[PDB]
């Protein structure tokens, strides 16, 4: 049909435009709905031509912007879904249409209960009269603190993720439920972690090797929390885990325009000085301690089995 | 009946590794002096060749033998005659040898896109596995100078320099004690293991522990390479734990197990605490 | 040892308890004999296992669950109950004046081979379990023995308290 | 008709989950000498369990398990009625009596989850007397295979992992550490075992008196003199109470203290655990699940002045002795479980060893 190509080009144009739309969960839902439409584009004799089809399309998806991985790894788990269906006909033509339909239907359903399960396991970790530390927001963190503030009392402090700021938008978003939170500059975090006791990080992309590819500022805060030995928790779901690898990927960083750091009222200074700022930094697996997920918390090393059982381990080639 | 067959493969062919030579030795030595039974043949002659092969001071040999005995254990059927227990079911061993010869190709394919340009490299003594990954990295049209150490039970590192200048990269050898003199110069310290054990420990030659303690001294990531063979099944704690027969003036020491950062094999990339996860996946 | 057949041949179905594991399975020496050890193909409890292959000069036998899924039991309990009635008395014995440390190895089976289990047939000791509940049951016990019948060993083997069968 | 339980004196605000409870009151001042709900052998072994002679984790699990054995050895379910849900509807209020008699040590929580697993497995249209018989057979074969076969396998690993000319310390208390040390000793090995304890308890006098009746030399001191022993020892053993999901050895009062001061002078640590001693939930540190024993037991017999005697008259005064505490994962090196010498962070692999997958 003509509809498939125009709507996937609508998604690659809202991909190439940059940051946005709304969040990764809208990315999940709409990319899953588009791939729901794709498995009803046209028939296929055996699995291989659908695989080259979806492989080429997800290949362009990853290649058009290597910044995030949500569409990439939902394509990869659709690939292990057909791989186990391929296993569950020889273990080509019976009900594979309806089977992949119901498969991604339960994928949708377990996606829309993700942050609510996060709110369920949000309780036991933080205490009362204690202080938690966040850099920017994922809406995971919003559901987290919104659940855990409704029955206890704590004191969240937040240093924003400001090449350009959006942690102040987190601050004004959660402050209208009144947890008595404070904000500070991004370079005052080191002294104040003598009086913190635990820290979360709301990340966006987590990779295979236990490390995490979060917003910038998380590396220096991770090293500062190392030099005070407070525990490190990362509130990412199992959903946005990636199999990719740090220097296997040629500069997984993505810089944005340095207008947000050196503004364009600069005078004559500009044309002899390089200026660059990432959105995404890299912080080793050595330093986190406690995942939380849909099924419960896991070790920093234990995301390895989550990769190997949640992804067919040779779809590293998208 | 096979001991100089094994030593012919060993020191009249220095191409392959010692473990893969041992496993080729006994896999082609399924044509045995015929006792023709499942258990007794297996037990006495394989344990006997693992004993009688113990004139060398290596540690990969007996491990590779036991890895083969855990290979042969799995798909050994029972179908009422002593022909296809394994005496006809031997093509499994053929596919095993070719897949764990292709292992070195696949670690080269895995790690060729992993050393970044501009990063100079300091390295310990020789392997048959550092050169394939570094020349699959050079053959991706990259550029990096290399340092290497002396590694003295012998004049060793000159062999690594002669091999690698022939493989076209700028090489400079250094004295053994000059590690911390030049450790900070490096951006990347890769190490071919002798044998990898279940806690991330790398028993190896006399200076890999130097590399690890200087690596934590510099916080520079410390990467080790191993194939599917040489996962030895000991467990070490300190500097007397490994057996004395593996040692003999020592000749092997033991690095700390919990400070290396990324390793990789046939089964992909592994954080060095998933080594137990895959070793439980081994030996059935 | 209680059989004179030195190597137990094909479809001998024994339930020896598993002792010490291997890298293939478990080195299990069968309690039926003394010097016969084995194998299991892919913790310490017994199980019904048949024997498949055989050697002569080297002594290594092998055994697993080949095909024997639905098999009835009571032949095997009869097997090792008769085989355990014959250890504390009936390997060495004498025209009984029991030395209790050992008796002679070459004057060992001068009558015991012909009467207990290595007789004419498998219905041989079938009939020796059907008629001979013990020789007390009935009291018209058999003739045709190397002894008169059992004149010294009558009281001493089984006929002590009730012969409970 | 509904059991209740109160608290004793001043209480720390940081422990809203787990309260303090004093060992100096009855548990029959609210319910009679019979009870139509609660079972007599249950209150028997629970009052055994509460006062503090049933101390070891293996021992308290087998005690609770034989209590449940006595429960389902005679319990007649009345007819026109369902087996499984009514059994759990009776036995989990019994679990409430347990956790309010004395709080949970989650190995027995794994035990009651196993009991749920077994009672919902055997059906209800099945005739129930031999179902009770096979159920009691199932649970006692379960508990003997776990306890003694894990002890024999850990002893089997332990035969080789002690050198000669070395020494070793132990801390904590269980029957398995005693079996390990004497079944290491009596085979020609020659090593003296220093034994270290703490206060308010000095629990490991148990292990010391067992070890000297096994005829092994020793020397005894306390972990605030553990800065003296780190020049001498060559390997350090620990006990373990429970095994937290990211490799935290939930364990005795001064365990992680000894681990820290062990690799502060770099002598590698070694713990011991088993199969059912693994929970599901996960936590960061101490301040969630950690009991309090008696407060007033802190006492010295020196002169005429107990230096915490008048505790109750004070109100601007608090005290703590946390006993059941945690450890960061990357300083406990490895465990000796029955599956083998397996490193720390690799522990939670046993969640899906179930369906052969």
Curated annotation (Swiss-Prot), chain A:
Q: Transmembrane: is it a keyword of this entry?
A: no
Outcome recorded upon mutating residue 138 to F: In VWM2; with ovarian failure
Q: Which disease is it linked to?
A: Leukoencephalopathy with vanishing white matter 2: An autosomal recessive brain disease characterized by neurological features including progressive cerebellar ataxia, spasticity, and cognitive deficits. Brain imaging shows abnormal white matter that vanishes over time and is replaced by cerebrospinal fluid. Disease severity ranges from fatal infantile forms to adult forms without neurological deterioration. The disease is progressive with, in most individuals, additional episodes of rapid deterioration following febrile infections or minor head trauma.
Q: Which UniProt keywords apply?
A: Cytoplasm, Disease variant, Initiation factor, Leukodystrophy, Protein biosynthesis
Which Gene Ontology MF annotations are present?
ATP binding; GTP binding; guanyl-nucleotide exchange factor activity; translation initiation factor activity
User: What GO terms fall under cellular component here?
Assistant: cytoplasm; cytosol; eukaryotic translation initiation factor 2B complex
Signal sequence span is none
Q: Where's it found, cell-wise?
A: Cytoplasm, Cytosol
Q: How is its activity regulated?
A: Activated by the chemical integrated stress response (ISR) inhibitor ISRIB which stimulates guanine nucleotide exchange factor activity for both phosphorylated and unphosphorylated eIF2.
Q: Does Transmembrane show up as a keyword for this record?
A: no
Name used for this protein in its record: Translation initiation factor eIF2B subunit beta
Effect of changing residue 180 to G: reported as:
In VWM2; with and without ovarian failure
Residue ranges crossing the lipid bilayer per the database entry = none
> Cross-referenced Pfam families, in alphabetical order?
IF-2B
What is any one GO biological process for this UniProt entry?
A: response to glucose
Q: Name the family the entry cites.
A: Belongs to the eIF-2B alpha/beta/delta subunits family.
Curated annotation (Swiss-Prot), chain B:
Task: Name the linked condition.
Answer: Leukoencephalopathy with vanishing white matter 1: An autosomal recessive brain disease characterized by neurological features including progressive cerebellar ataxia, spasticity, and cognitive deficits. Brain imaging shows abnormal white matter that vanishes over time and is replaced by cerebrospinal fluid. Disease severity ranges from fatal infantile forms to adult forms without neurological deterioration. The disease is progressive with, in most individuals, additional episodes of rapid deterioration following febrile infections or minor head trauma.
Q: In what way is its activity controlled?
A: Activated by the chemical integrated stress response (ISR) inhibitor ISRIB which stimulates guanine nucleotide exchange factor activity for both phosphorylated and unphosphorylated eIF2.
Cellular component terms per the entry's GO annotation: cytoplasm; cytosol; eukaryotic translation initiation factor 2B complex; membrane; plasma membrane
Tell me what this protein is called.
Translation initiation factor eIF2B subunit alpha
Q: Which family does it belong to?
A: Belongs to the eIF-2B alpha/beta/delta subunits family.
Q: Does the keyword Lyase apply?
A: no
The source organism is Homo sapiens
Which Pfam family is one of this chain's hits?
IF-2B
Question: Could you tell me the gene encoding this protein?
Answer: EIF2B1
Q: Which residues carry this modification: N6-acetyllysine?
A: 31
Which InterPro entries does this entry report, sorted A to Z?
Answer: eIF2B_alpha/beta/delta, elF-2B_alpha_N, IF-2B-related, IF_2B-like_C, NagB/RpiA_transferase-like
Q: Name one GO molecular function term.
A: translation initiation factor activity
Subcellular location(s): the record lists: Cytoplasm, Cytosol
> What is a biological process (GO) this protein takes part in?
cytoplasmic translational initiation
Swiss-Prot record, chain C:
Keyword field: Acetylation, Cytoplasm, Initiation factor, Mitochondrion, Phosphoprotein, Protein biosynthesis, RNA-binding, Translation regulation
Q: Which residues carry this modification: Phosphoserine?
A: 136
Segments forming domain S1 motif: 11-66
For this protein, the activity regulation entry reads: This results in the global attenuation of 5' cap-dependent protein synthesis and concomitant translation of ISR-specific mRNAs that contain a short upstream open reading frame (uORF) in their 5' UTR, such as ATF4, ATF5, DDIT3/CHOP and PPP1R15A/GADD34.
Q: How is it modified after translation?
A: Substrate for at least 4 kinases: EIF2AK1/HRI, EIF2AK2/PKR, EIF2AK3/PERK and EIF2AK4/GCN2.
Q: Which GO terms describe its cellular component?
A: cytoplasmic stress granule; cytosol; eukaryotic 48S preinitiation complex; eukaryotic translation initiation factor 2 complex; extracellular exosome; glial limiting end-foot; membrane; mitochondrion
Keyword Acetylation attached: yes
A GO biological process of this protein is: stress granule assembly
MF terms in GO? ribosome binding; RNA binding; translation initiation factor activity
Subcellular compartments: Cytoplasm, Stress granule; Cytoplasm, Cytosol; Mitochondrion
In terms of domain of life, where is this protein from? Eukaryota
Main location class: cytoplasm
> Which residues carry the post-translational modification N6-acetyllysine, per the record?
119
Q: What induces it?
A: Up-regulated upon endoplasmic reticulum stress.
- Recorded family membership: Belongs to the eIF-2-alpha family.
Q: What is this protein called?
A: Eukaryotic translation initiation factor 2 subunit 1
Q: What is the lineage of its organism?
A: Eukaryota, Metazoa, Chordata, Craniata, Vertebrata
In the complete protein, the residues contained here run 7 to 187 of 315
Curated annotation (Swiss-Prot), chain D:
- Oligomeric form and interacting partners: Component of the translation initiation factor 2B (eIF2B) complex which is a heterodecamer of two sets of five different subunits: alpha, beta, gamma, delta and epsilon. Subunits alpha, beta and delta comprise a regulatory subcomplex and subunits epsilon and gamma comprise a catalytic subcomplex. Within the complex, the hexameric regulatory complex resides at the center, with the two heterodimeric catalytic subcomplexes bound on opposite sides.
Report activity regulation: Activated by the chemical integrated stress response (ISR) inhibitor ISRIB which stimulates guanine nucleotide exchange factor activity for both phosphorylated and unphosphorylated eIF2.
Q: What is the effect of changing residue 324 to H?
A: In VWM4; with ovarian failure
Q: Which GO terms describe its biological process?
A: cytoplasmic translational initiation; myelination; oligodendrocyte development; ovarian follicle development; regulation of translation; response to glucose; response to heat; response to peptide hormone
The UniProt entry's sequence similarity note says: Belongs to the eIF-2B alpha/beta/delta subunits family.
The region called May bind the chemical integrated stress response (ISR) inhibitor ISRIB is annotated at 5-14
* Record's GO cellular component terms: cytoplasm; cytosol; eukaryotic translation initiation factor 2B complex
Give the organism the record lists. Homo sapiens (Human)
Coiled-coil ranges from the UniProt annotation = none
Q: What is this protein called?
A: Translation initiation factor eIF2B subunit delta
Question: Subcellular localization, per the record?
Answer: Cytoplasm, Cytosol
Q: A GO molecular function for this record?
A: guanyl-nucleotide exchange factor activity
Which UniProt keyword terms apply here?
Acetylation, Cytoplasm, Disease variant, Initiation factor, Leukodystrophy, Phosphoprotein, Protein biosynthesis
């Amino acid at each position: 049909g003509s509809e498939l190509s125009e709507r996937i080009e609508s998604f690659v144009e809202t991909l190439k435009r940059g940051g946005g739309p709304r969040s990764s969960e809208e990315m999940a839902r709409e990319t899953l709905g588009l791939l729901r439409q794709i498995i009803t584009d046209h028939r296929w004799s055996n699995a291989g031509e659908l695989m080259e089809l979806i492989r080429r399309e997800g290949r362009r998806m990853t290649a058009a912007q290597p910044s995030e991985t949500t569409v990439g790894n939902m394509v990869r788990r659709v690939l292990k879904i057909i791989r186990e269906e391929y296993g569950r006909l020889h273990g080509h033509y019976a009900q594979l249409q309806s089977n992949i339909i119901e498969a991604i239907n339960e994928l949708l359903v377990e996606l829309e209960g993700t942050m609510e399960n996060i709110a369920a396991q949000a309780l036991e970790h933080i205490h009362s009269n204690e202080v938690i530390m966040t850099i920017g927001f994922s809406r995971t963190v919003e559901a987290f603190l919104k659940e855990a503030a409704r029955k206890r009392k704590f004191h969240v402090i937040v240093a924003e993720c400001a090449p350009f700021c959006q942690g102040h938008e987190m601050a004004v978003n959660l402050s209208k439920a009144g947890i008595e939170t404070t904000v500070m500059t991004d370079a005052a975090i080191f002294a104040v972690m003598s009086r913190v006791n635990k820290v979360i990080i709301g990340t966006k992309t987590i990779l295979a090797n236990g490390a995490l590819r979060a917003v910038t500022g998380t590396h220096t805060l991770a090293l500062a929390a190392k030099h005070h030995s407070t525990p490190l928790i990362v509130c990412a779901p199992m959903f946005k885990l990636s199999p990719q690898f740090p220097n296997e990927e040629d500069s997984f960083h993505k810089f944005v325009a340095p207008e947000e750091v050196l503004p364009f009222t600069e005078g004559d200074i500009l044309e002899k000085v390089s200026v660059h700022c990432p959105v995404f930094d890299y912080v080793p697996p050595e330093l986190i301690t406690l995942f939380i997920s849909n099924i419960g918390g896991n070790a920093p090393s234990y995301i390895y089995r989550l990769m190997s059982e949640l992804y067919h381990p040779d779809d590293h080639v998208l | 009946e096979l001991i100089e067959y094994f030593k012919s493969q060993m020191k009249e062919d220095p191409d392959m590794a010692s473990a893969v030579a041992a496993i080729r030795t006994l896999l082609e030595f399924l044509k045995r002096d015929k006792g023709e039974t499942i258990q007794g043949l297996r037990a006495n002659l394989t344990s006997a060749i693992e004993t009688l092969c113990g004139v060398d001071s290596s540690v990969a040999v007996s491990s590779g033998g036991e890895l083969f005995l855990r290979f042969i254990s799995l798909a050994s059927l029972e179908y009422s005659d002593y022909s296809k227990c394994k005496k006809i079911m031997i093509e499994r061993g053929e596919l095993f040898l070719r897949r764990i010869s292709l292992s070195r190709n696949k670690i080269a394919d895995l790690c060729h896109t992993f050393i970044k340009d501009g990063a100079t490299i300091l390295t310990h003594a020789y392997s048959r596995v550092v050169l394939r990954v570094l020349e699959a990295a050079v053959a991706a049209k990259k550029r990096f100078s290399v340092y290497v150490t002396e590694s003295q039970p012998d004049l060793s590192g000159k062999k690594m320099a002669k091999a690698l200048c022939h493989l076209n990269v700028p090489v400079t050898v250094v004295l053994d004690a000059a590690v911390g003199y030049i450790m900070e110069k490096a951006d990347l310290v890769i190490v071919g293991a002798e044998g990898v054990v279940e806690n991330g420990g790398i028993i190896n030659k006399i200076g890999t522990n130097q590399m690890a303690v200087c690596a934590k001294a510099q916080n520079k990531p410390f990467y080790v390479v191993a194939e599917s063979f040489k996962f030895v099944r000991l467990f070490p704690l300190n500097q007397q734990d490994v057996p004395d027969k593996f040692k003999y003036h020592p000749w092997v020491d033991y690095t700390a197990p919990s400070l290396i950062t990324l390793l990789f094999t046939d089964l992909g990339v592994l954080t060095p605490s998933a080594v137990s996860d895959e070793l439980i996946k081994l030996y059935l | 040892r209680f059989y004179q057949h030195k190597f137990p041949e094909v479809e001998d179905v024994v339930m020896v308890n598993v002792r010490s594991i291997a890298e293939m399975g478990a080195y299990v020496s069968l309690l039926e004999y003394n010097n016969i050890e084995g194998m299991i193909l892919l913790i310490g409890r017994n199980e019904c296992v048949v024997v498949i292959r055989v050697d002569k000069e080297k002594g290594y036998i092998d055994l697993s669950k080949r095909r024997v899924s639905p098999e009835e039991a009571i032949k095997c309990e009869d097997k090792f109950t008769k085989s355990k009635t014959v250890y504390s008395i009936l390997r060495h014995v004498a025209e009984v004046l029991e030395y209790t440390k050992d008796e002679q190895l070459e004057s060992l089976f001068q009558r015991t081979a012909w009467v207990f289990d290595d007789k004419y047939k498998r219905p041989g000791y079938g009939a020796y379990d059907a008629f001979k509940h013990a020789v007390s049951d009935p009291s018209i016990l058999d003739s045709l023995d190397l002894n008169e019948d059992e004149r010294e060993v009558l009281i001493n083997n089984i006929n002590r308290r009730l012969t409970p069968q | 008709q509904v059991p209740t339980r109160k608290d004793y004196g001043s209480k720390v605000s940081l422990f809203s989950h787990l309260p303090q409870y004093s060992r100096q009151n009855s548990l029959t001042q609210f319910m009679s000498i019979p009870s139509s709900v609660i079972h007599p052998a249950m209150v028997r072994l629970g009052l055994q369990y509460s006062q503090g002679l049933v101390s070891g984790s293996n021992a308290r699990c087998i005690a609770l398990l034989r209590a449940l054995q006595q429960v389902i050895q005679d319990y007649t379910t009345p007819p026109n009625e369902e087996l499984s849900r009514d059994l759990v509807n009776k036995l989990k209020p019994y679990m409430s009596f347990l956790t309010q008699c004395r709080p949970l040590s989650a190995s027995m929580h794994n035990a009651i989850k196993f009991l749920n697993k077994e009672i919902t497995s055997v059906g209800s249209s099945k005739r129930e007397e031999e179902a009770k018989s096979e159920l009691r057979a199932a649970i006692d074969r379960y508990v003997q295979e776990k306890i003694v076969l894990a002890a024999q396998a850990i002893s089997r690993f332990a035969y080789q992992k002690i050198s000669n000319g070395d020494v070793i310390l132990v801390y904590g208390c269980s029957s398995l550490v005693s079996r390990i040390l004497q079944e290491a000793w009596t085979e020609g090995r020659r090593f003296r075992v220093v034994v270290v304890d703490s206060r308010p308890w000095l629990e490991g006098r148990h292990t010391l008196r067992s070890l000297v009746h096994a005829g092994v030399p020793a020397s005894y001191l306390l972990i605030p003199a553990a800065s003296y022993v780190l020049p001498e020892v060559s390997k350090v053993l620990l006990g373990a109470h429970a095994l937290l999901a990211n490799g935290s050895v939930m364990s005795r009062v001064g365990t992680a203290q000894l681990a820290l001061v062990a690799r502060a002078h770099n002598v590698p640590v070694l713990v011991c655990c088993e199969t059912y001693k693994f929970c599901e939930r996960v936590q960061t540190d101490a301040f969630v699940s950690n009991e309090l024993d008696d407060p007033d037991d802190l006492q010295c017999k020196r002169g005429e002045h107990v230096a915490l005697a008048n505790w109750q008259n004070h109100a601007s005064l608090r005290l703590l002795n946390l006993v059941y505490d945690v450890t960061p994962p990357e300083l406990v090196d490895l465990v000796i479980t029955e599956l083998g010498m397996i490193p720390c962070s690799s522990v939670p692999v046993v969640l899906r060893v179930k369906s052969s997958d």
